[PDB]
Amino acid sequence: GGVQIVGQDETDDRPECPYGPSCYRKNPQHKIEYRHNTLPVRNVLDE
Ligand SMILES: [Zn+2]
C-alpha cells in the first residue's frame, strides 16, 4: 500500500555522475549511485 514518493528507499544523497548532460547509459545501479543534476525532489515550495 503506498502510491507516492514519500520514502522510496533512502535515495536522496547521490554524489554526481561524471557524464552529467552527456550521459546516455541505462543502468539500474547508475540511476541510484550517480545523479545527473542538483535539485531536490519534494521540497520546492513549502506551503
Ligand atoms: Zn550518468
Coordinates of C-alpha atoms and ligand atoms in Angstrom, one line a residue:
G1 CA 0.0 0.0 0.0
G2 CA 1.5 3.4 -1.0
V3 CA 1.4 5.0 -4.5
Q4 CA 3.5 8.1 -3.8
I5 CA 7.2 9.3 -3.4
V6 CA 7.3 9.8 0.4
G7 CA 10.3 7.5 1.4
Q8 CA 11.1 5.5 -1.8
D9 CA 14.3 3.9 -0.4
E10 CA 16.6 6.4 1.3
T11 CA 18.0 7.6 -2.1
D12 CA 18.3 11.5 -1.7
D13 CA 22.1 11.9 -1.3
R14 CA 23.6 10.9 -4.7
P15 CA 27.1 12.4 -5.4
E16 CA 27.3 13.4 -9.2
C17 CA 27.6 11.3 -12.4
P18 CA 30.7 12.3 -14.4
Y19 CA 28.7 12.2 -17.8
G20 CA 26.2 14.8 -16.5
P21 CA 24.4 16.3 -19.5
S22 CA 26.2 13.9 -21.9
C23 CA 25.0 10.7 -20.1
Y24 CA 23.2 8.2 -22.4
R25 CA 23.6 4.9 -20.4
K26 CA 20.6 3.0 -18.8
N27 CA 21.8 1.0 -15.8
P28 CA 19.8 0.0 -12.7
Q29 CA 22.6 0.9 -10.1
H30 CA 23.8 4.0 -12.1
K31 CA 20.4 5.9 -11.6
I32 CA 20.9 5.2 -7.8
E33 CA 24.7 5.7 -7.5
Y34 CA 25.3 8.9 -9.5
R35 CA 22.7 11.7 -10.1
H36 CA 22.6 14.0 -13.2
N37 CA 21.7 17.4 -11.8
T38 CA 21.4 19.3 -8.4
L39 CA 17.7 19.8 -7.4
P40 CA 15.5 18.5 -4.6
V41 CA 12.6 16.1 -5.4
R42 CA 10.0 17.1 -2.7
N43 CA 10.7 20.4 -1.0
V44 CA 10.2 23.1 -3.8
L45 CA 7.5 25.4 -2.3
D46 CA 6.6 24.6 1.3
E47 CA 3.0 25.8 1.9
Ligands
ZN1 ZN 25.0 9.1 -15.7

